[PDB]
């Protein structure tokens, strides 16, 4: 995948999530909650990505909201 | 020109031909607490702390 | 990382007379046939590096470039590097120099005026010869 903000910070999402799954399925839940809490309390933006996407080119204009110049 | 900490009690509204100033009422905490009104600019959120560098600036209303 | 060359307040290459204010080796706009990829290619062919100190650069490299351009057809190097190629009056690309001569020959407008063509007047009036639209946009050329 191309895009810095995509694969970067996804490496940290992956390290947190892989650690979570490993400790949950292998050792217990208490160590999971402790270390996962440390990692995802360092920063929040791991588990949540930006939902922002390019929006549709709209009606009678160059883009989504801009409109062609009106004459009188 | 003392520095006094006061809490916003209510947000009145804007003024001007097109609207360019904001009205709040701030109450003191350590100056024999009483209600004083003052106009304000910028994001001064719901019940935040407005700092009075002076106890004499009022808001001329309407 | 030291060089015993001495700073020269006056330097002369091609008899031009222009305001020497900035640095050199890419402000060679006074030199007509050197710079950019061709000069980079020649210098890389000469196997030289950038381990010296900028600011004080002499003119020997560009002299060597013009020297190789004196006989460019011997080595069969890709020959789309000269300015006016496949012109009438010669099947080759000869040498010329000095300013006040090149800017005119950028528009070889003797035979195209002699033939009684619209092209001579299109070129002469400073207007389009290919048809750049000139009523709302396309107003540059005389200001």
């Amino acid at each position: 995948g191309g895009g810095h903000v995509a694969q970067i910070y996804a490496i940290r999402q992956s390290i947190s999530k892989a650690l979570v799954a490993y400790y949950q399925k292998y050792v217990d839940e208490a160590s999971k909650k402790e270390i996962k809490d440390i990692l995802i309390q360092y920063d929040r933006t791991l588990l949540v990505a930006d939902p922002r996407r390019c929006e549709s080119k709209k009606f009678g204009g160059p883009g989504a909201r801009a409109r062609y110049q009106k004459s009188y | 020109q003392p520095i006094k900490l006061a809490r916003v009690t209510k947000v009145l509204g804007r003024t001007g031909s097109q609207g360019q100033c904001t009205q709040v009422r701030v109450e003191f905490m350590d100056d024999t607490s009483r209600s004083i009104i003052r106009n304000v600019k910028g994001p001064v959120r719901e019940g935040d702390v407005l700092t009075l560098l002076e106890s004499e600036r009022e808001a001329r209303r309407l | 990382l030291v060089i015993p060359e001495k700073f020269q307040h006056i330097l002369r290459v091609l008899n031009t007379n222009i305001d020497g204010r900035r640095k050199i080796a890419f402000a060679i706009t006074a030199i007509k046939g050197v710079g950019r990829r061709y000069a980079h290619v020649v210098l890389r062919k000469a196997d030289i590096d950038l381990t010296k100190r900028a600011g004080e650069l002499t003119e020997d490299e560009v002299e060597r470039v013009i020297t190789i351009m004196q006989n460019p057809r011997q080595y069969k190097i890709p020959d789309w590097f000269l300015n006016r190629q496949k012109d009438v009056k010669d099947g080759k690309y000869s040498q010329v120099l000095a300013n006040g001569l090149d800017n005119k020959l950028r528009e070889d407008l003797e035979r195209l005026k002699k033939i009684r063509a619209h092209r001579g007047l299109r070129h002469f009036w400073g207007l389009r010869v290919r048809g750049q639209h000139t009523k709302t946009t396309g107003r540059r050329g005389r200001t």
Binding site: - | - | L1, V2, I3, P4, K6, F7, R21, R22, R53, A54, G55, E56
Partner: protein
């Protein structure tokens, strides 16, 4: 309107400005370029020659601000 500075390398004048850099509290290419009003590339070459002399260690490189430091 570039200023005129003595750049000639002489038996005497050359060894009078090369031992003036370490006589300042703030000694960086930025400080020299903003204060002594000579090319910062000259200061970069000076620190490169210092690195060649063997009293520092190079870490990273850049077209404006390079990293040369010491741990002794």
């Amino acid at each position: 309107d570039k200023l005129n500075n003595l750049v000639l390398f002489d038996k005497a004048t050359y060894d009078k400005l090369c031992k003036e850099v370490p006589n300042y509290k703030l000694i960086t290419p930025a400080v020299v370029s903003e204060r002594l009003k000579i090319r910062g590339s000259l200061a970069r070459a000076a620190l490169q020659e210092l690195l060649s002399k063997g009293l520092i260690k190079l870490v990273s490189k850049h077209r404006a601000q390079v990293i040369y430091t010491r741990n002794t």
